Structure 1
Amino acid sequence: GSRRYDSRTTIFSPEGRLYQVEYALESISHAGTAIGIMASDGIVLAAERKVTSTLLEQDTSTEKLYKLNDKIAVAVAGLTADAEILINTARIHAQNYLKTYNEDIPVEILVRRLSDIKQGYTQHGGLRPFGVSFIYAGYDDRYGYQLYTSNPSGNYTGWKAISVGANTSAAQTLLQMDYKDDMKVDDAIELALKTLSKTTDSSALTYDRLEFATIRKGANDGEVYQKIFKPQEIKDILVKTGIT
């Protein structure tokens, strides 16, 4: 019958690895690099769009940076379509929590929920896993500014600075070198752009190949603002930091 055609997506190898998870991670390593850096006064999210065209409408385009709510955003590395499925689920979970407790969802609770959904696809159901790695940038009043990552296995970890996608080994070494604990957002903006500029597979880093976002308490008094940078604003910050 049908058993003949079953790939068995949720089995261990003789070495105790999950075949499909490992292969999904291999897919993600070819996606555009996304970087997250956490500072004392905010968080930076920087990401590289994959080899674009002059005829792509950039100002209405979004493939890397997504808003989950007013306090939490994600950077995507992998299959965009897979990511949007999970992103919509995460947006709903955040609203479910807000309706139930009348408080904005703590960052870790949202991250754990999405990660558990990824885990399920590796243990039961016989379906392929989601080929997506996330960087979560968020703020809540318990832990303040937070950075997390999750991958197709459903495992998640916290970070001061982190990269996903292509050239993570090179990117992580550069971040480990220049990152300091007392760093500020404006310094972190410069570090993120400098790291992408050195790790990119493109010839030069220009405004049309980037997506950029900051989460600042640089919002008038005790509150948090998300800023998804416009094409002209990415062009200006590239001149300011002296990359173009």
Structure 2
Amino acid sequence: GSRRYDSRTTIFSPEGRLYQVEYALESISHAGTAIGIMASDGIVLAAERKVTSTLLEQDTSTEKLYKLNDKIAVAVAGLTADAEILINTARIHAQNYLKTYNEDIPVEILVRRLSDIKQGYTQHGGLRPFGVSFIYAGYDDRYGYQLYTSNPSGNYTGWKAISVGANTSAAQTLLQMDYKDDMKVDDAIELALKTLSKTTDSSALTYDRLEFATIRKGANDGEVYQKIFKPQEIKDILVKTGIT
């Protein structure tokens, strides 16, 4: 009858919340931690990849930070496989926006498109919701720097500092004390590195399992420079922060 094998993914609980997104919000906590700090001069995205070993390739390997546009970059926290489709759809939507308006897509539009994609599955279709939450960073002439976050529920809010993933509460509590409104990029970077050091489950902090994405604006005006910190430059900030 094709009924007994159905799990009723989009069903309201007796008290009144969904159950599949409820467990997706638990699956999020079991993934690698990510951190996002909103600084006056730029935005720093950092994440600690999980399941690290000596045989893990680090030369050309980015699994938590992804590029959607020359100005906009995102951080993935959750199941990378499900995040891949969302990343591809976001890139397609951004390129279609450039097709339609010939102007850089604002971050809010892409954030809405991805939230709608998640909500469509959380609403109908009877399919499991995406178990991934994003951290959006970008720039424009509308509101300057922007730092949103996503959820499997498909809701997004603006944040001056966020950390989705494992030990979210500890990272948030650590960052809220040290967060001011006037850091440069370097202060935010060192704060994020200290937070990652104090929230990690291992003992030391080796450059292999840390990823960095920064947004900077220098002599050139109107265009920021997006640089994904490679391991050779990654090991540099470790001595600057004093962790070494």
Normalising by the residue count of structure 1, what TM-score does the alignment of the two structures yield? 0.98
Rounded to whole Å, the distance in 2 between the matches of 1:154 and 1:93 is: 17
Unaligned runs of 5+ in 2: none
Q: Deviations over 1:145-191 (max 9, x none)?
A: 01000010001110001000000000001111100011111100001
After TM superposition, give the deviation of residue 60 of structure 1 in Å: 1.4
Q: Deviations over 1:133-156 (max 9, x none)?
A: 100011011001010000100011
Distance in 2 of aligned mates of 1:65 and 1:202: 21
Following superposition, the deviation at residue 221 of structure 1 comes to 3.6
SS in 2 for 1:164: coil
Counterpart position of 2:59: 59
Deviation by residue 1:48-76 (Cα, 9 ceiling, x = unmatched): 01131111111111210000100111111
Counterpart-to-counterpart distance in 1, 2:243 and 2:174: 17
Moved more, 52-61 or 42-51: 52-61
Q: CA deviation at 1:223?
A: 1.8
Structure 1 residue 218: deviation in Å?
Answer: 2.9
Rate the CA distance shift 1:219–1:199 in 2: closer, same or farther, 3 A.
farther
Report deviation, 1:219: 5.7
Instruction: Find the counterpart in structure 2 of residue 95 from structure 1.
Output: 95
Whether contact under 8 Å (1:39, 1:184) holds in the other structure is yes
Whole-angstrom CA distance in 2 between matches of 1:194 and 1:86: 30
Separation of aligned partners in 2, 1:221 and 1:4? 61
Matched pairs, number: 244
**1:122 deviation in Å?**
1.0
Distance in 2 between residues matched to 1:29 and 1:148, nearest whole Å: 18
Post-superposition CA distance 1:75-100 (Å, at most 9, x none): 11100000011000000000000000
Structure 2 CA distance for partners of 1:56 and 1:219, relative to 1, 3 Å:
farther
CA contact (8 A) 1:219 1:225 kept: no
Taking a change above 3 Å as real, the CA distance of residues 219 and 73 of structure 1, as seen in their structure-2 partners, is farther
Q: Is the 8 A contact 1:35 1:192 kept in 2?
A: yes
- Partners of 2:219 and 2:54 in 1: CA distance: 35
Quick one: distance in 1 between partners of 2:51 and 2:81?
18
**Partners of 1:132 and 1:221 in 2: how far apart?**
34
SS at match of 2:139: strand
* Cross-structure match for 2:110: 110
Cα distance change of structure 1 residues 219 and 228 upon mapping to structure 2, 3 Å threshold: farther
Deviates more, 1:48-57 or 1:154-163: 48-57
Is the CA contact 1:78–1:133 (under 8 Å) kept in the aligned structure 2?
Answer: yes
Q: Which runs of 5+ in 1 are unaligned?
A: none
Work out whether residues 215 and 226 of structure 1, in 8 Å CA contact, stay in contact via their aligned partners in 2: yes
Distance in 1 (CA, whole Å) between partners of 2:43 and 2:238 is: 18
CA deviation string 1:18-69 (max 9, x = no partner): 1000101101101111001111110000100113111111111121000010
- CA deviation string 1:195-219 (max 9, x = no partner): 0100111111110011111011136
Structure 1 runs, 4 residues or longer, greater than 4 Å off = none
CA distance in 2, matches of 1:78, 1:21: 13
Cα distance in structure 1, aligned partners of 2:8 and 2:218 = 50
